């Protein structure tokens, strides 16, 4: 059973693919019910499956243009109002912005000298407490956040500009 994006969490401006694998940002807000689990301001969506224990892999195909960030979020990530996109808010992610790849550390993001990215493998380890990112062509390490996760952790996707996308690949 492979991951799919959870439409009930998705910001109403996001457009999810029919197969629930891909996400881009739309030009209008869909008329969707506001549900406590739905991100109402930040351009985020979670997968429908979260993890409380064990080790897990998934892969994310990434657009070549700016606008995306992806990784994992603690389930308690704030859904309502404009919120920071930071580890303190329970978001551990890579981001493409200004033509540069970043690990979204705080208060300053960390630039990654990894070269062009096409698909990224995410390795989540809830037994030791880490989430790691690898570029699939050679499995070169991109970044590892070491976190003592204290709750369920969900795959996280965010697209805040048109002209880029993220897609779960399995």
């Amino acid at each position: 059973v492979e991951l799919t994006l959870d439409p009930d969490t998705a910001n109403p401006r996001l457009i999810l693919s029919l197969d629930l694998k891909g996400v881009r940002l739309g030009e209008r807000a869909q008329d969707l019910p506001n549900h406590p689990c739905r991100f109402d301001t930040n351009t985020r969506v979670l997968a429908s499956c979260g993890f409380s224990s064990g080790r897990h892999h998934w892969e994310v195909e990434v657009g070549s243009k700016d606008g995306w960030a992806f990784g994992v979020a603690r389930e308690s990530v704030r859904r309502k109002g404009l919120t920071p996109f930071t580890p303190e808010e329970g978001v551990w992610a890579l981001q493409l912005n200004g033509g540069q790849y970043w690990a979204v550390t705080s208060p300053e993001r960390s630039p990654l000298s990894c070269g062009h990215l096409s698909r990224v493998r995410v390795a989540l380890d809830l037994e030791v407490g880490a989430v790691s990112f690898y570029a699939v062509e050679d499995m070169r390490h991109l970044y590892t956040f070491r976190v003592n996760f204290q709750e369920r952790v969900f795959p996280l996707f965010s697209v805040c500009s048109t002209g880029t996308y993220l897609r779960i690949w399995p």
């Binding site: 351009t43 700016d66 606008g67 404009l82 996109f85 805040c160 500009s161």
Partner: peptide, 6 residues
């Protein structure tokens, strides 16, 4: 600026 909603 363009990423405030990320």
């Amino acid at each position: 600026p363009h990423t405030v909603l990320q």
